[PDB]
């Protein structure tokens, strides 16, 4: 899950502060790639 990825611990600061992955990135499900977008009669679609 994105929640689990977001709390990935990148480092602890000298003052004991924590830097989590979500503190340097946006975490979301999203396409392996974003190059291909299809429409069926002008409406958002996928297909095979």
């Amino acid at each position: 899950s994105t929640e689990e990825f977001g709390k990935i611990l990148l480092k602890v600061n000298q003052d004991g502060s924590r830097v989590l992955l979500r503190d340097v990135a946006k975490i979301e499900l999203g396409g392996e790639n974003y190059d291909i977008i299809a429409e069926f009669n002008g409406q958002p679609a996928s297909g095979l």
Partner: protein
């Protein structure tokens, strides 16, 4: 006892009564120290948890890593079993060998209602595990804000 452990896990209510009426040890323990209560708690068998308790099952039995049935119930989100266990005197602040409490486990999986019940029976919010973490610490790290405010 072995039949009981098995019946407890399979959620076979009637079977549990039968071996009970034939007097099998309520506190029988398998190789990892799980009692029939541990088993019913883990798998979510509410009615079997109740039959076992009224037959004098140790509500505070612990396995070979110090974990009680209340740990299991809280961790796996079995709100009713949690309440039944608590109403029957389950130690709400019970720690396993890791210093982990039922509140730690409920918090960590975000079982808000369960968290509230545990607090209702006087869970120690400041209780730390072996790494010095509280339930609050856990809610923050998980970025659970709903849970986080309930813990303040």
């Amino acid at each position: 006892g072995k039949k009981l452990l098995e019946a407890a896990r399979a959620g076979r209510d009637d079977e549990v009564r039968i071996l009970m009426a034939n007097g099998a040890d309520v506190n029988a323990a398998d190789v990892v120290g799980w009692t029939p209560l541990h088993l019913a708690a883990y798998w979510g068998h509410l009615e079997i948890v109740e039959v076992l308790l009224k037959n004098g099952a140790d509500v505070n039995a612990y396995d070979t890593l110090g974990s009680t049935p209340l740990h299991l119930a809280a961790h796996f989100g079995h709100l009713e079993i949690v309440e039944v266990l608590l109403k029957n005197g389950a130690d709400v602040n019970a720690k396993d060998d890791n210093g982990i409490t039922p509140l730690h486990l409920a918090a960590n999986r975000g079982h808000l209602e369960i968290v509230e019940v545990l607090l209702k029976y006087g869970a120690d919010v400041n209780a730390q595990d072996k790494f010095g973490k509280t339930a609050f610490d856990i809610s923050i790290n998980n970025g659970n804000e709903d849970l986080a405010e309930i813990l303040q």
